[PDB]
Paper text:
Receptor-regulated SMAD (R-SMAD: SMAD1, SMAD2, SMAD3, SMAD5 and SMAD8) proteins are key transcription factors of the transforming growth factor-β (TGF-β) superfamily of cytokines. MAN1, an integral protein of the inner nuclear membrane, is a SMAD cofactor that terminates TGF-β superfamily signals. MAN1 interacts with MAD homology 2 (MH2) domains of R-SMAD proteins using its C-terminal U2AF homology motif (UHM) domain and UHM ligand motif (ULM) and facilitates R-SMAD dephosphorylation. The SMAD2–MAN1 and SMAD1–MAN1 complex structures show that an intramolecular UHM–ULM interaction of MAN1 forms a hydrophobic surface that interacts with a hydrophobic surface among the H2 helix, the strands β8 and β9, and the L3 loop of the MH2 domains of R-SMAD proteins.
Co-crystals of the SMAD1–MAN1 complex were obtained using the phosphorylated-state mimics of the MH2 domain of SMAD1 (residues 259–465 (S463E and S465E), SMAD1C-2E). The SMAD1–MAN1 complex contains two SMAD1 protomers (chains A and B) and two MAN1 molecules (chains C and D) in its asymmetric unit and forms two SMAD1–MAN1 complexes. Each SMAD1 forms a trimeric structure with symmetrically related SMAD1 structures generated by a crystallographic three-fold axis. The SMAD1–MAN1 complex structure shows that the MAN1 binding mechanism of SMAD1 is approximately the same as that of SMAD2; the SMAD1 MH2 domain binds MAN1 using the hydrophobic surface of the H2 helix, the strands β8 and β9, and the L3 loop. The interfacial area between SMAD1 and MAN1 (the A–B interface of the SMAD1–MAN1 complex) is approximately 620 Å2. By contrast, the hydrogen bonds and salt bridges around Arg775 of MAN1 in the SMAD2–MAN1 complex are not observed in the SMAD1–MAN1 complex. The MAN1 binding surface is highly conserved between SMAD2 and SMAD1 except for Tyr366 and Trp368 of SMAD2; Tyr366 and Trp368 of SMAD2 are substituted for His364 and Phe366 in SMAD1, respectively. When the structure of SMAD2–MAN1 complex and that of SMAD1–MAN1 complex are compared, the distances between the MAN1 Phe770 and the MH2 domains of SMAD2 and SMAD1 are different; the minimum side chain distance between the MAN1 Phe770 and the SMAD2 Trp368 is 3.7 Å (between chains B and E in the SMAD2–MAN1 complex), although that between the MAN1 Phe770 and the SMAD1 Phe366 is 3.3 Å (between chains A and B in the SMAD1–MAN1 complex). This difference suggests that the hydrophobic core between SMAD1 and MAN1 is more compact than that between SMAD2 and MAN1. ITC experiments showed that Trx-MAN1(762–890)-SDED bound to SMAD1C-2E and SMAD2C-2E with dissociation constants of 0.35 and 3.3 μM, respectively.
Numbering used by the authors:
A (entry chain B), B (entry chain B), C (entry chain B): 762 to 888
D (entry chain A), E (entry chain A), F (entry chain A): 266 to 465
The structure:
Amino acid sequence: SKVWQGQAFHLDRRNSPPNSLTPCLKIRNMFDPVMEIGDQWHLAIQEAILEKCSDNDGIVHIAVDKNSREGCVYVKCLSPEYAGKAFKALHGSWFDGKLVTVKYLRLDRYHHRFPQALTSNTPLKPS
Amino acid sequence: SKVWQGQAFHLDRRNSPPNSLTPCLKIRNMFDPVMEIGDQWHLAIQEAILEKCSDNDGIVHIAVDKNSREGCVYVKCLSPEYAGKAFKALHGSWFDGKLVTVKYLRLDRYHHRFPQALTSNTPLKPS
Amino acid sequence: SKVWQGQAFHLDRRNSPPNSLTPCLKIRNMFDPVMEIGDQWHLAIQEAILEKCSDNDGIVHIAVDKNSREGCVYVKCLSPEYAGKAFKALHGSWFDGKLVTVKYLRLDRYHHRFPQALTSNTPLKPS
Amino acid sequence: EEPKHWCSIVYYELNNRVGEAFHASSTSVLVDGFTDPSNNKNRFCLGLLSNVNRNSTIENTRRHIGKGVHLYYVGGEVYAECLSDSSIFVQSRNCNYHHGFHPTTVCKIPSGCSLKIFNNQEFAQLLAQSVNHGFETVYELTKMCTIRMSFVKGWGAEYHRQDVTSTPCWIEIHLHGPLQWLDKVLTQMGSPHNPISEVE
Amino acid sequence: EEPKHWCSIVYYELNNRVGEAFHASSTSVLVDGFTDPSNNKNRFCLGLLSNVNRNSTIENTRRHIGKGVHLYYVGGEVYAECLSDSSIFVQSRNCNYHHGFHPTTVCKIPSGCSLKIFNNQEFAQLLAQSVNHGFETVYELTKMCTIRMSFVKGWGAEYHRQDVTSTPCWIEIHLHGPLQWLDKVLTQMGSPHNPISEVE
Amino acid sequence: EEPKHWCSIVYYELNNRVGEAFHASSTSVLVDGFTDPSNNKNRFCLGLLSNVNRNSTIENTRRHIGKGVHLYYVGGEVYAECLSDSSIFVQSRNCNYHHGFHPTTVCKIPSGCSLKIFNNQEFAQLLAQSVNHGFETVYELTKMCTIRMSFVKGWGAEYHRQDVTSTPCWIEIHLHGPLQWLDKVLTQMGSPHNPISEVE
């Protein structure tokens, strides 16, 4: 069920992480909001991202989009190096039977949608 | 027509004759009684068996079943060695376009059906 | 359009010119009279034969059949050597998208159809 | 339950497949060496087939196929009747299981003779008994749904040609009935409890 | 415009084609390792297929195909859903072009996962953009209309098997929709302005 | 009498068969190098076909097939019309017999040219004359019912490629009419009075 199932390919050589100069990510294909019930279901989505990024001590703000059917969750990090480390952990990985992809987002627009993310600076961890 | 046409395979190695401890055989697929006319037709069946077993000096009683559509003819021999020699001559051989197979039968039951076979002890030969 | 397009094969070895003992040829598949207009169209047919036989200094009489749908044109030469030289130039060659073949004709019958050809002895050439 | 075609046949020359597959549309199919190109009724003609690897040995054997073999399916049984002037050589595990022959046995059918090379009920009975022996035992029954057979030239233990792929002219028959019945059992037994790597 | 069959599939073992081609007649096609011989509806069964060059390595991989892969074509998109207990390995240039992957990338689909392996609109869009780049650019799009995919065993950069022809069990899918749309562009672009000898 | 399909065509690359066979359903069939995958009407498209043994030499020749060849069957005769920008090379024993050419002759058809490559009446006439010469003479007529033909690259006596299997792109045509008429004679002549062993 709601389990990680490895990666579709190894991110090296011809599929190398871009390492963009942003700390902001958009994570894709993680769920379908119309197949979730209650309003506690986003916690399992946030924790699943932190469980896959247990090594990463740089995620500071995490936001799950409960309306888009793209199944998006947004994350901001301290530096682009932390954001690249989360990219490597998630991009091309299998979750709940669907293939997760990651896109970099500009920093100005990220704060425009999530103004709360400025103060959020303590690292997040799994339970 | 009513001719022998060799064997379907050679009885050696993987298809070796069992050499059972009985002198009684049941020979199969030799005719169809509904395609025979008159009541002299069994002589050609008996002679065909002796022609194929011209070497065998041990057949003593031969009986053709004129009712079973299996085309069976029963034979009893002096010893199981003679019955095995007739097995090798007939099993897997081609007669009148059909493949003849041989089965061993228990000695007690053979005499029950053919009580005449006890005294029959002189060897039978072709003409 | 009305162009030569090489030969279908090279006339040597297994398809060697017969070199018959006649100076008369029948050339085939050169046109379709029902697809020609006016009565000047035969000049282009005669010239096309001389252009392909520019080397040949031995053609003396040329006649285009404007009725046969076989697209025939008849030629007579001085000697069978000249007629063989024209055979090599034309047989198996491509003209106006169709394959031209050549046949030898008897000398007696040629004059019977074209009596004008006796005096015709000056060589013909392209323009 | 009955399949669309009761068998399909494929023709080989040595180790090479030759021509398109044949699908039976009647209870009677003829495999001969002549040239009628309609392979959508009762006749499977091999003479018209091309093979760029054909050699003199194969060519001479095709000349002797002649009227070939008559395969027909009447009353839940399959028969091979040798119409050719030369013999045919059939290997049928179901036929071998019936008579007690070794499973690999090749049976020579001389010209004019007929042999029962399959029985539906015996297979269906063997299938039901095989279910209690595990997946591998039932999957092995796939081998029983095919019959291989060569023209003119023998193969097997007695002959220098050990495998059918050493004969110049042979066919392989797939019995769609048994394959269908086996399929409905194989799909209800799951899979083997074994591992397989993705790297080795 | 829609084709008669939305795809056709062909099965290989190593470098050898095995069996007849499969032509889809519904939006859903199943490629599994079982033995139902009707290849004229939704099921393409590989277990019944013979191959005279099969070896132990290939045979063991076929035993683990199981329920195989579910390929279906709904709403102008093609999906691969791995019903097998072992993984499948798909290479789809159109899928790779979508996600920014390298065009040669092979995607592991673990058991139970589904992957979108084609999108009609993206191809049609790429086709229209390609027309202004010359004949060769549009002819290269032919490569995008095929999807190669192997069972159990991986291939590509990470694996010792570099080419799909090194895997024991794989199939090749031809997407007839895209091929049709590409054809109507290729036939209106003429030919390349290049020479070719008839002797060399 | 007329056959279901007047011809069937098979495409080769060097010595390897490529793709499925094509069966004509109209008097006109087009063999070109484009990608329309419907091989059930008038167009036999070769561009979409895959071949794991394809090399650079074959690939470059396929790029120049273009509009290819137009084969049609009107008034008891078969024609080859070269629509390609490069030439085609046809070997037709019936065509060679007509013009007195050597039976093995390969005819170059330049771009834009048409050649009559078969005549039904001439074959039927040759068949009737052949019956009084024995079985072997009539069986040799099987060779006349096939036409081999290559794109772009020549073959035969003049070329380094002696056999058609040395050309990168060729097809083989089977004329079902003649094959049918020959079949009804071959089946009434019996078999050759020759021996063949079952062991050698």
